[PDB]
Amino acid sequence: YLEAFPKELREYYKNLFGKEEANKIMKKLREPVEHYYIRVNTLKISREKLIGELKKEGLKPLRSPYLPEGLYFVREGPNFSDDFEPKLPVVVANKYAAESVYQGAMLYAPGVLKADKNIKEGDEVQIRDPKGLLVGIGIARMDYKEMTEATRGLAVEVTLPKFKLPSLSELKAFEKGYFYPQGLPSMVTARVLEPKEDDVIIDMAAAPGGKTTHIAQLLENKGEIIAIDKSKNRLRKMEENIKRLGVKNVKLVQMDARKLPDLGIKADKILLDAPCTALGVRPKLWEERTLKHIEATARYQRAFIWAAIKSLRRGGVLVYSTCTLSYEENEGNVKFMIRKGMKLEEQSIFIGSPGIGMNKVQRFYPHKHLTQGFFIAKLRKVKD
Ligand SMILES: Nc1ncnc2c1ncn2[C@@H]1O[C@H](CSCC[C@H](N)C(=O)O)[C@@H](O)[C@H]1O
Numbered sequence: 001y002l003e004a005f006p007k008e009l010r011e012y013y014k015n016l017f018g019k020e021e022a023n024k025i026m027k028k029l030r031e032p033v034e035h036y037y038i039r040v041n042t043l044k045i046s047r048e049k050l051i052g053e054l055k056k057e058g059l060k061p062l063r064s065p066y067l068p069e070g071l072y073f074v075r076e077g078p079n080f081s082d083d084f085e086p087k088l089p090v091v092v093a094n095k096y097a098a099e100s101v102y103q104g105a106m107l108y109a110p111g112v113l114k115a116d117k118n119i120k121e122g123d124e125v126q127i128r129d130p131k132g133l134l135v136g137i138g139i140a141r142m143d144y145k146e147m148t149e150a151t152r153g154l155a156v157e158v159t160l161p162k163f164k165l166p167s168l169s170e171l172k173a174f175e176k177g178y179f180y181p182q183g184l185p186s187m188v189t190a191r192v193l194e195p196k197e198d199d200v201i202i203d204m205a206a207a208p209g210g211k212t213t214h215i216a217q218l219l220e221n222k223g224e225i226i227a228i229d230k231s232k233n234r235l236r237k238m239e240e241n242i243k244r245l246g247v248k249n250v251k252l253v254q255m256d257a258r259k260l261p262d263l264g265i266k267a268d269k270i271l272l273d274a275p276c277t278a279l280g281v282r283p284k285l286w287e288e289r290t291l292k293h294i295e296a297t298a299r300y301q302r303a304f305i306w307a308a309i310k311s312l313r314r315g316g317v318l319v320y321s322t323c324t325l326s327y328e329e330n331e332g333n334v335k336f337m338i339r340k341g342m343k344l345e346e347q348s349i350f351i352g353s354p355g356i357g358m359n360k361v362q363r364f365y366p367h368k369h370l371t372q373g374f375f376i377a378k379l380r381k382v383k384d
Pocket of ligand 1: 186205207210230234
């Protein structure tokens, strides 16, 4: 698994976590989350009612004892060994198709990069990513010719994915806005913010609106949430998410969040779920980002943070979160905040790990908590 991570990053992890822990983290990072979480949209349905609906569809949702809005599905796999060499013709899936097949998706024709020319419908085939990673085994539903030419349709029925997570996007329950797939750490983040119907609230990197819509249901669609993002497309997706979930609580504004103080607003609550190197996201087939990215991105985040601090009322609260493992983007950037008149505060839910040499922030690790790598800091603005 070590091969998935560039050498300097591997050394970075070893230095930051220790060899043993670093190896455990990288090993687990290569795999999908063991517990696949969704958020119950309490704007439309209760937890137990939704469970009833999911059991109807043959699913086995389990309840979280920490998040009353949390449900998770247990992951299946690995369905074959890491060294397994099937005696099968090869279908090569592109980078994006391979990651979904790796988690139980079918392989569709646009997801096909190239393939063995002997392949005919009904043949048993093995599916590999462009770098030779075996991600699944299945049965071809197209001949070679159609597989490499079709613009749509089913190319390989994946009957033996490396791992299996439930597909929920096609469920009626999903279409009716009953839930939103979202990781446990991300859900804890919105809770730890403790939004109140009275609060002036800003999500300054909000799209596609996972944490924004969670705030909306915690507010029970009362008050107002200001949601910022620079990307019009991701905002477009956020508009669809809002409509589907029945969220009436949110005001979308497109802009560079680093210029936030240009508004006249002094917020009581700010969520900064910041753009990051995403070193913690799963599954991690091949890690492309490295040290140069950590420094650059950490520096990039400081612009957001400063903008947030200046836009916070005194006594105001900032929640900073990332889906990355790096020190610089996390504990390092919190020290920055501490130098700018912010103070660490106890988080209302703490089920993760302590931060690196730092007491009140909350970290999540894949090998310890069965989640994506994650980071959460909660701060109080004591002065300007
Ligand atoms: N300079 C900038 N100003 C505002 N938003 C930015 C930005 N640079 C990146 N972003 C946005 O920051 C987001 C980080 S992903 C955040 C996901 C979101 N909080 C959720 O829970 O669903 C991306 O959507 C990206 O569009």
